[PDB]
A paper describes a structure:
The metabotropic glutamate receptors (mGlus) play critical roles in modulating synaptic transmission and neuronal excitability, and dimerization is mandatory for these receptors to exert their functions.
The PAM binding mode observed in the mGlu2–mGlu4 heterodimer suggests that the mGlu4 PAM may also activate the mGlu4 homodimer in the same manner. In mGlu4, the residue at the key position 5.47 is serine with a short side chain, which is incapable of forming interaction with W6.50 and loses the stabilizing effect on the rotamer conformational change. Indeed, the W6.50 residues in the G protein-free mGlu4 subunits of the Gi1–mGlu2–mGlu4 and mGlu4–Gi3 complexes display a rotamer conformation similar to that in the active subunits.
Numbering used by the authors:
A (entry chain R): 599 to 703
B (entry chain R): 756 to 853
C (entry chain A): 6 to 56, 183 to 354
D (entry chain B): 40 to 340
E (entry chain C): 29 to 47
F (entry chain D): 2 to 121, 136 to 247
């Protein structure tokens, strides 16, 4: 959790840097929130196994094993298309727009 | 859930190895494949300890602890060895940030 | 409604043709070719032939290029170029063989500075400052047959260096590439020319590809 | 008159590239537009369908024209030839009739004087009068100081004005071919040219937000319709059939409408996400059309 | 020109029912 | 610009025979193709219609699987694919060229056609008073009936006017809204208020003997006049 907080603080402070722009700044907060949920499911499991807590454990696990690797997968696909299409056309590979990537994720 | 995650990991790996020709500025291919393999190793280590301690004491102490440890380890590997090099370059070497 | 339905269906049939025609136009890359008076702007178009605006078409690595010349058109250049907004790459051709002249036969300016007065203007008007400005260095072979004669001090008084190709070549980039008051978005692709080789069209493909890639990267906040 | 803001009854989609041309026929039902995709498209606001889509030999076409009888269409552009297309053909498809060559200057306005005569004006500082039968310049209008790119005709088909972007505003004649009247005093290059429906007034639109009108009988500056806080330019201008309404197309992604004497804004046609380069009003006076660079055509009625 | 502007008192684009 | 019918006809009684008319000198790609059929004695009636791109497959009220239409646009020709036979098939089949847009003149040029002999809601619009023997110069007038109004709220009347010389292909005189079409000569006009239409030809001359038609085009099912019998 401390490392994730440091990462988000670094990424939002220098939000105009090309290196953070090259990493998919739009599809980076989603990945970091997914890692945060993957961390927080440990705290949730530590707590009492109430009905609400039992449901929340499953919800957090299902969301966390998937959201991070979908944000990463989506980013990879987008970058590959950008360069791949640019090799033969100028009208963009497809909906690489940040709202589109969010929608795909 | 683990099967869906592993399928997503396989798609991520095939995508990473498809997009290996990108220059070093956006070369998020080797770290992504490395992270996929590390998560696969973590889950393949989780499987035996989780699924073997069935008819034994401290099943609750073993299964939940090993599952949350594996989840935390995968998340830590992904977050660290995905972004920590970039944070290092940003705020420890203020010369490649342009 | 039989005729109205047929008329409506006629528009749909035409709309399908527009999409097919638009798809070909979308993948087609527009190239702007310009230069000064006999500044080598006509020598480049004769290179990628086998492999008043004139238009030439050629294919190079699954790309449909199209040049739009300006030498044959004489009008107010700075006010009809708005139609060329969105052109992916603008090829500028200058020959390194005319850095001297008896005035200009129309004003008081040598060809070198006159060409530099067009390269800077074409990269400063608020129409083309989005993608790139591709530069071509023509008359590369004949440049050596004039550098050991009267040096660049004739055109460039502040020239302080050697009298060889290596020292001169580095200067040429400074004269032309360092003509942008803005460098965050615009880039200059300075690269020489070959008289009888196919490397000239090779520089066209990757440079146009590079700006195409950066165009997608610049959009969506990823570059 | 009032504050008639806007009314977008319909939007003519389909276009992909920027539009610099739009003309309306005498039937008050057909519209013709041009685009940089090399596809000249004829529209109609009553049904909103593509009645004709004739491909363009030059993708840089910057002008359009419709014959008074609705039988011919013309294009210009940075190609120096006027490709005349006959709409009414036995074969059905739209084909070129004659290419008017011999300008050596960029083309941005070629209005149809009649079914046989063309008043093509080029960017080589000289205008011309063309004949369909022979395909040669019957008249050789010369005397301007700069390139002219916008003309406007008159209902009587006996007078026209050629205005270059150098404060020329020279008034020519169809037959004798000399500058009968000249108007000077403009502080910037002009880009929009219109004619009064009555045929006794003449206005200009320049790249300085100073849309002004003059008089044919007396050469003096009328009301200049001073802008309040507009710093952009004007690309197109047109007059309604009423004669008490001024419509101009501005570079600030919108259009403005004034009155004959009030000289104040009477409505904003901001519905386009780009600068407006086309404007026209039907000869009857019903509905208005607007073309812009975002490849979108809309009808204001 | 003033008379011509007001000549078409029954013009359009102000108030009508036709399209 | 020139259409002639071929493919066969009168091959044998009771045997199916598909026929097709050859076309030339026009696009056809953006052209509607009809298969309007003429009765052996009098009456030219419509049975099939295909539009550009084969989108429109409107058929006659005598709907049957044997009646099909195929646009040979690539060949600029057309297909019929006739199946079986019937006593109604003894007829005179023609070919029609038509286009649909504002200001267009559908049903302009018709082919010569061929005779196919076989052995062993709607406006209908039949010219009731189709018998007026008058010498040239008498300003012939032909009146056709109409069950309901032919104005589909568009301000124009979807009615076509024809002229069929003996032994020659029918020629359209004035298209919808009573306007000249097909480059035919002048003095061809005629209009009416509603459900009542008349023919106005003044300065009458020769080369107009034959049969006249009155066609409606409100919707899919088309109809024409049974027959006009006005001669010199
Ligand atoms: O034990 C492991 N993987 C595994 C997973 C399922 C069944 C079985 Cl027999 C073995 C393993 C994985 C990684 C490193 C060390 N060890």
């Amino acid at each position: 959790i401390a490392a994730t907080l440091f990462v988000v603080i670094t990424f939002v402070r220098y939000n105009d840097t090309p290196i953070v722009k090259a990493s998919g700044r739009e599809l980076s907060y989603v990945l970091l929130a997914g890692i945060f949920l993957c961390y927080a499911t440990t705290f949730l499991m530590i707590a009492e196994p109430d009905l609400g807590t039992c449901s929340l454990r499953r919800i957090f696990l299902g969301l966390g094993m998937s959201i991070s690797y979908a944000a990463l997968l989506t980013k990879t696909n987008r970058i590959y298309r950008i360069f791949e299409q640019g090799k033969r056309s100028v009208s963009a590979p497809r909906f690489i727009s940040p709202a589109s990537q969010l929608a795909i994720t | 859930l683990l099967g869906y995650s592993m399928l997503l990991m396989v798609t991520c790996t095939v995508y990473a190895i498809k997009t290996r020709g990108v220059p070093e500025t956006f070369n998020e291919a080797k770290p992504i494949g490395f992270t996929m393999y590390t998560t696969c190793i973590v889950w393949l280590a989780f499987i035996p300890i989780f699924f073997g301690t069935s008819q034994s004491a401290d099943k609750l102490y073993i299964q939940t602890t090993t599952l949350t440890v594996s989840v935390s380890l995968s998340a830590s590997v992904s977050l660290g060895m995905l972004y920590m090099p970039k944070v290092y370059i940003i705020l420890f070497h203020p010369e490649q940030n342009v | 409604s039989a005729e109205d339905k047929a008329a409506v269906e006629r528009s749909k049939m035409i709309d399908r043709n527009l999409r097919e025609d638009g798809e070909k136009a979308a993948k087609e890359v527009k190239l702007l070719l310009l230069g000064a008076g006999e500044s080598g702007k006509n020598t480049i178009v004769k290179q990628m032939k086998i492999i008043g605006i004139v238009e030439t078409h050629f294919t190079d690595k699954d790309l449909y290029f199209k040049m739009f010349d300006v030498g044959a058109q004489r009008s107010e250049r700075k006010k009809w170029i708005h139609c060329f907004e969105g052109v992916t790459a603008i090829i500028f051709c200058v020959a390194l063989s005319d850095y001297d002249l008896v005035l200009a036969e129309d004003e008081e300016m040598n060809r070198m500075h006159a060409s530099m007065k067009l390269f800077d203007s074409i990269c400063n008007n608020k129409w083309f400052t989005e993608t790139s400005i591709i530069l071509f260095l023509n008359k590369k072979d004949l440049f050596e047959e004039k550098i050991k004669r009267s040096p660049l001090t004739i055109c460039y008084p502040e020239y302080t260096g050697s009298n060889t190709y290596e020292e001169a070549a580095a200067y040429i980039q400074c004269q032309f590439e360092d003509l942008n008051r803005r460098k965050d978005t615009k880039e200059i692709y300075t690269h020489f020319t070959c008289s009888t080789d196919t490397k000239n069209v090779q520089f066209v493909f990757d440079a146009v590809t590079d700006v195409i890639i950066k165009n997608n990267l610049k959009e969506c906040g990823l570059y | 008159v009032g504050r008639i803001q806007m009314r977008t009854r319909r939007t003519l989609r389909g276009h992909l590239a920027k539009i610099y041309a739009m003309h309306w026929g005498t039937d008050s039902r057909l519209l013709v537009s041009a685009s940089q995709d090399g596809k000249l498209i004829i529209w109609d606001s009553y049904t909103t369908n593509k009645v004709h889509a004739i491909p363009l030999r030059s993708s840089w076409v910057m002008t359009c024209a419709y014959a008074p009888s609705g039988n011919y269409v013309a294009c210009g552009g940075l190609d120096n030839i006027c490709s005349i297309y006959n709409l009414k053909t036995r074969e059905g498809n739209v084909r070129v009739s004659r290419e008017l060559a011999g300008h050596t200057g960029y083309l941005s306005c070629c209005r149809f004087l009649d079914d046989n005569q063309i008043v093509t004006s080029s960017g080589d500082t000289t205008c011309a009068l063309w004949d369909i039968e022979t395909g040669q310049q019957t008249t050789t209008f010369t005397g301007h100081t700069g390139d002219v790119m916008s003309l406007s005709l008159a209902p009587d088909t006996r007078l026209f004005v050629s205005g270059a972007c150098d404060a020329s505003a020279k008034l020519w004649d169809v037959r004798e071919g000399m500058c009968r009247q000249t108007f000077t005093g403009h502080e910037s290059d002009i880009n929009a040219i219109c004619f009064f429906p009555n045929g006794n007034a003449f206005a200009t639109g320049s790249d300085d937000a100073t849309c002004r009108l003059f008089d044919l009988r007396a050469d003096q500056e009328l009301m200049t319709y001073s802008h309040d806080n507009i710093i952009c330019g004007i690309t197109s201008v047109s007059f309604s059939k009423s004669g008490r309404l001024l419509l101009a197309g501005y570079d600030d992604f919108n259009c403005n409408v004034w009155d004959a004497l009030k000289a104040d804004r009477a409505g904003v046609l901001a519905g386009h996400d780009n600068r407006v380069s086309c404007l026209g009003v039907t000869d009857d006076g019903m509905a208005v059309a607007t073309g812009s660079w975002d490849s979108f055509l809309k009808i204001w009625n | 020109k003033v008379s011509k502007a007001a000549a078409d008192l029954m013009a359009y684009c102000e108030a009508h029912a036709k399209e | 610009v020139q259409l002639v019918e071929s493919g066969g006809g009168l091959v044998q009684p009771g045997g199916s025979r598909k026929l097709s008319c050859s076309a030339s000198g026009f696009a056809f790609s953006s052209f509607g193709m009809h298969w309007v059929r003429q009765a052996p004695e009098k009456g030219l009636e419509w049975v099939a219609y295909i539009s550009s791109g084969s989108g429109t497959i409107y058929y006659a009220d005598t709907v049957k699987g044997r009646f099909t239409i195929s646009r040979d646009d690539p060949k600029n020709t057309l297909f019929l694919q006739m199946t079986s036979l019937r006593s109604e098939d003894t007829a005179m089949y023609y070919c029609v060229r038509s286009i649909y847009y504002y200001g267009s003149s559908p049903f302009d040029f018709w082919g010569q056609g061929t005779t196919l002999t076989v052995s062993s809601s709607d406006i209908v619009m039949t010219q009731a008073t189709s018998s007026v023997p008058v010498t040239p110069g008498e300003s012939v007038s032909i009146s056709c009936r109409s069950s309901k109004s032919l104005l589909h709220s568009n301000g124009n009347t979807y009615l076509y006017w024809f002229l069929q010389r003996p032994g020659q292909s029918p020629q359209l005189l004035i298209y919808r809204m009573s306007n000249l079409a097909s480059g035919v000569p002048d003095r061809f006009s005629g209009s009416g208020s509603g459900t009542a239409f008349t023919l106005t030809i003044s300065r009458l001359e020769a080369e107009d003997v034959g049969v006249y038609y009155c066609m409606q085009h409100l919707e899919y099912p088309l109809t024409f006049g049974a027959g006009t019998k006005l001669e010199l």
